[PDB]
Write an enzyme that holds these catalytic residues in place. Structure first.
Site, PDB file in Angstrom:
ATOM      1  N   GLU A 115      42.168  12.672  12.097  1.00 48.92           N
ATOM      2  CA  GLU A 115      42.074  13.789  11.173  1.00 48.92           C
ATOM      3  C   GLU A 115      41.787  13.278   9.765  1.00 48.92           C
ATOM      4  O   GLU A 115      41.053  13.920   9.011  1.00 48.92           O
ATOM      5  CB  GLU A 115      43.354  14.617  11.193  1.00 48.92           C
ATOM      6  CG  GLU A 115      43.672  15.183  12.569  1.00 48.92           C
ATOM      7  CD  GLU A 115      42.774  16.343  12.976  1.00 48.92           C
ATOM      8  OE1 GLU A 115      41.739  16.601  12.317  1.00 48.92           O
ATOM      9  OE2 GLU A 115      43.116  17.029  13.962  1.00 48.92           O
ATOM     10  N   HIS A 118      38.327  12.751   9.364  1.00 51.31           N
ATOM     11  CA  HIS A 118      37.673  14.039   9.187  1.00 51.31           C
ATOM     12  C   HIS A 118      37.706  14.422   7.716  1.00 51.31           C
ATOM     13  O   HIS A 118      36.663  14.722   7.125  1.00 51.31           O
ATOM     14  CB  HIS A 118      38.334  15.118  10.040  1.00 51.31           C
ATOM     15  CG  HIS A 118      38.096  14.960  11.513  1.00 51.31           C
ATOM     16  ND1 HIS A 118      38.654  15.822  12.425  1.00 51.31           N
ATOM     17  CD2 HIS A 118      37.450  13.964  12.174  1.00 51.31           C
ATOM     18  CE1 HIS A 118      38.352  15.331  13.612  1.00 51.31           C
ATOM     19  NE2 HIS A 118      37.624  14.207  13.511  1.00 51.31           N
ATOM     20  N   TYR A 122      34.637  15.161   4.897  1.00 52.33           N
ATOM     21  CA  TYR A 122      34.463  16.355   4.076  1.00 52.33           C
ATOM     22  C   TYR A 122      34.195  15.938   2.637  1.00 52.33           C
ATOM     23  O   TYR A 122      33.339  16.514   1.975  1.00 52.33           O
ATOM     24  CB  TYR A 122      35.678  17.266   4.174  1.00 52.33           C
ATOM     25  CG  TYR A 122      35.871  17.805   5.571  1.00 52.33           C
ATOM     26  CD1 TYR A 122      34.771  18.162   6.352  1.00 52.33           C
ATOM     27  CD2 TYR A 122      37.147  17.924   6.129  1.00 52.33           C
ATOM     28  CE1 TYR A 122      34.937  18.620   7.653  1.00 52.33           C
ATOM     29  CE2 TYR A 122      37.323  18.385   7.430  1.00 52.33           C
ATOM     30  CZ  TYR A 122      36.214  18.731   8.187  1.00 52.33           C
ATOM     31  OH  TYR A 122      36.369  19.189   9.471  1.00 52.33           O
ATOM     32  N   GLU A 204      43.289  24.194  16.204  1.00 50.83           N
ATOM     33  CA  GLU A 204      42.215  23.342  16.692  1.00 50.83           C
ATOM     34  C   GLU A 204      41.315  23.950  17.754  1.00 50.83           C
ATOM     35  O   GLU A 204      40.109  23.693  17.778  1.00 50.83           O
ATOM     36  CB  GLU A 204      42.773  22.004  17.181  1.00 50.83           C
ATOM     37  CG  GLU A 204      43.454  21.189  16.080  1.00 50.83           C
ATOM     38  CD  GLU A 204      43.831  19.786  16.516  1.00 50.83           C
ATOM     39  OE1 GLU A 204      44.433  19.634  17.598  1.00 50.83           O
ATOM     40  OE2 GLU A 204      43.535  18.831  15.769  1.00 50.83           O
ATOM     41  N   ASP A 237      35.827  15.097  18.574  1.00 46.71           N
ATOM     42  CA  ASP A 237      37.227  14.698  18.439  1.00 46.71           C
ATOM     43  C   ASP A 237      38.131  15.896  18.676  1.00 46.71           C
ATOM     44  O   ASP A 237      39.165  15.793  19.336  1.00 46.71           O
ATOM     45  CB  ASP A 237      37.523  14.164  17.027  1.00 46.71           C
ATOM     46  CG  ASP A 237      36.852  12.838  16.731  1.00 46.71           C
ATOM     47  OD1 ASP A 237      36.608  12.046  17.666  1.00 46.71           O
ATOM     48  OD2 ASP A 237      36.589  12.573  15.538  1.00 46.71           O
ATOM     49  N   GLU A 238      37.756  17.030  18.100  1.00 41.12           N
ATOM     50  CA  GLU A 238      38.538  18.251  18.229  1.00 41.12           C
ATOM     51  C   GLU A 238      38.805  18.625  19.692  1.00 41.12           C
ATOM     52  O   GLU A 238      39.881  19.103  20.038  1.00 41.12           O
ATOM     53  CB  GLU A 238      37.857  19.391  17.482  1.00 41.12           C
ATOM     54  CG  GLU A 238      38.818  20.470  17.046  1.00 41.12           C
ATOM     55  CD  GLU A 238      39.800  19.983  15.993  1.00 41.12           C
ATOM     56  OE1 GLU A 238      40.656  19.128  16.294  1.00 41.12           O
ATOM     57  OE2 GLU A 238      39.724  20.462  14.849  1.00 41.12           O
ATOM     58  N   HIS A 241      41.635  16.670  20.730  1.00 43.10           N
ATOM     59  CA  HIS A 241      42.826  17.193  20.083  1.00 43.10           C
ATOM     60  C   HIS A 241      43.389  18.412  20.791  1.00 43.10           C
ATOM     61  O   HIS A 241      44.584  18.427  21.106  1.00 43.10           O
ATOM     62  CB  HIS A 241      42.571  17.503  18.606  1.00 43.10           C
ATOM     63  CG  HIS A 241      42.142  16.314  17.804  1.00 43.10           C
ATOM     64  ND1 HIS A 241      41.785  16.431  16.486  1.00 43.10           N
ATOM     65  CD2 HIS A 241      41.955  15.033  18.210  1.00 43.10           C
ATOM     66  CE1 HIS A 241      41.384  15.230  16.117  1.00 43.10           C
ATOM     67  NE2 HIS A 241      41.470  14.353  17.132  1.00 43.10           N
TER      68      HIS A 241
END
EC number: 1.17.4.1
Lengths: 340, 340
Positions: A115, A118, A122, A204, A237-238, A241
């Site tokens: 995360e 991630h 951003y 998620e 990736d999500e 998750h």
């Protein structure tokens, strides 16, 4: 009651995923539920660095976008930035103090870590498309629209963290603190945890998939393709998750871990159904905010709100809940070429 | 007092490293201290997978070793496994709830994640050289020698965790809990954090370096070359970890961050010195245990103890403490062939 190294030798295979004896030795030779070991292996093999993706041309596309399209894009980006900021620290502060098996402990840490990658991506994007990144970042905490979704998600975490503190300090039972009564029930604690996991699964499994729709809508028109390459990797990736939280929730409800949990699962069917539905409603209200000034090619309020329903049904299905919508199909089937 | 997302917009560049407002938005476009961002980038660029290294040969090498030599190796490996088990979870559980700047928060999670990779690598080695990995892992907790190092290290973490819980829940000042009077002091908590940080610096800067010496002594003899490739990668990482804590300790005592800390740093000068000296002594008794059944080519009790003294002086000076041992040149210069 919490120790970074519990001195009691114990059989980690016989411990419950949560609330057992804190993990002391970190071994990966054996596992109670090898799904977590697989998630770790998978996540590690997916390791990527945002810096590697060239998002230079996106700067041009962004500048050329009309006002409302900028709005759609930027609002979506700000939201994601926020969700992953929470997702970065939270799994660690909230779940780590309650895990009882090595495989889960390491998975939570690995999940929290990805995360952060991630959140870095951003920044990498914002930095390269906006003139003053501070403008964007500041509004993430300000923006009343985003704020309404921020609290609610953070609430399920915050409550869990507070209750966990008391339990570790005072232990179970009724207590007195500065002349007030405080009741610490392990059952209440287990309930808070379950609810929190439902919320995180919604986050998620539903909220993030709505934003992916917006990002890929632009990519379809061959715009913001640097951003697209990154969302592609984040979405990959999500998937891992949400799979993790699904399995956790399902192991807990089937009572194959802790039977007091299976009871808690049923005593909450309604409260869980409600939080999921509430999430979907918020996302639909978000779609309003996004398209207030006009739609764009490939995406609008209707298409997005139907997608929210379709996606919500599928997710609730996976954790054994009742489908709250009639929607049976995905209005943007093209999103599948982007996913996984 | 702890929130997963503080709704108030604060200037993160003005917050202290610890005890300020909990970080909400995770941004990397700007930082108060460049050091933590640089560490994150480095750690990320060092990323390695234990699994990729071939250690099948080591099984034969290990089997061929005399009993005392197996003892030296295996005891060393158990110690390393224990230390990193604590290092995998502790920074996240103990430090995360107190951080108030983005870059430090992420560094801590990255550092912790990095530690979980080290733990996996230990499992990968153990199951490839020994028969029943369980005998090894089980001994790590029951072994009296190892347990004598474990409780000392974890106590610093544990005490910080517990006092942090009180402060978050009840805030500062004197309180009544089930009759007992508990005093929560912010200055007291700051001291515990500083002491804990000092302990972690000793852990990675001294304790681990001593084990690297054993690990590498075998590689010098061209034995356990697989374990050697791994320990090499781990050491490359450990170098970043101690640099991280040195900067934290130094920024703290310099007063450049929080002025009250510069004062706490001065008050705890002796306590910190005794702490480091105690660590060095403990490591010296460890060498005793390690060599009780005999020594090996290139390494023994004396040589090792000399290295303990040599390394301790250097680490202590880096964090502004007095040198407790005679000054001397590196007793095992060959170790530089393996480091960094």
């Amino acid at each position: 009651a919490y120790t970074t190294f519990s001195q009691t030798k114990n059989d980690q295979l016989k411990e419950p995923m949560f609330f057992g004896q804190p993990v002391n030795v970190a071994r990966y030779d054996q596992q109670k539920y090898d799904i977590f070991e697989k998630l770790i292996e998978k996540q590690l093999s997916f390791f990527w660095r945002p810096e590697e993706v060239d998002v230079s041309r996106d700067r041009i596309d962004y500048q050329a976008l009309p006002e409302h399209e900028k709005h759609i894009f930027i609002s979506n980006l700000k939201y994601q930035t926020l969700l992953d900021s929470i997702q970065g620290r939270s799994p660690n502060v909230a779940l780590l103090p309650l895990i009882s098996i090595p495989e889960l402990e390491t998975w939570v840490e690995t999940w929290a870590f990805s995360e952060t990658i991630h959140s870095r991506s951003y920044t990498h994007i914002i930095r390269n498309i906006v003139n003053d990144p501070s403008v964007v970042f500041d509004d993430i905490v300000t923006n009343e629209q985003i704020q309404k979704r921020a609290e609610g998600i953070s609430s399920y975490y915050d409550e869990l963290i507070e209750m966990t503190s008391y339990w570790h300090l005072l232990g179970e039972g009724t207590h007195t603190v500065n002349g007030k009564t405080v009741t610490v029930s392990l059952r209440e604690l287990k309930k808070k945890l379950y609810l929190c996991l439902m919320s995180v699964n919604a986050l998620e499994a539903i909220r993030f998939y709505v934003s992916f729709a917006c990002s890929f809508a632009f990519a379809e028109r061959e715009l913001m393709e640097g951003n697209a390459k990154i969302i592609r990797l984040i979405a990959r990736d999500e998937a891992l998750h949400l799979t993790g939280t699904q399995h956790m929730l399902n192991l807990l409800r089937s009572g194959a871990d802790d039977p007091e949990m299976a009871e808690i699962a049923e005593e909450c069917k309604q409260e869980c159904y409600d939080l999921f539905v509430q999430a979907a409603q918020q996302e639909k209200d978000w779609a309003d905010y996004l398209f207030r000034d006009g739609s764009m090619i490939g995406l609008n309020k209707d298409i997005l709100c139907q997608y929210v329903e379709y996606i919500t049904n599928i997710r609730m299905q996976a954790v054994g809940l009742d489908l709250p919508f009639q929607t049976r199909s995905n209005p943007i089937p093209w999103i599948n070429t982007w996913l996984v």
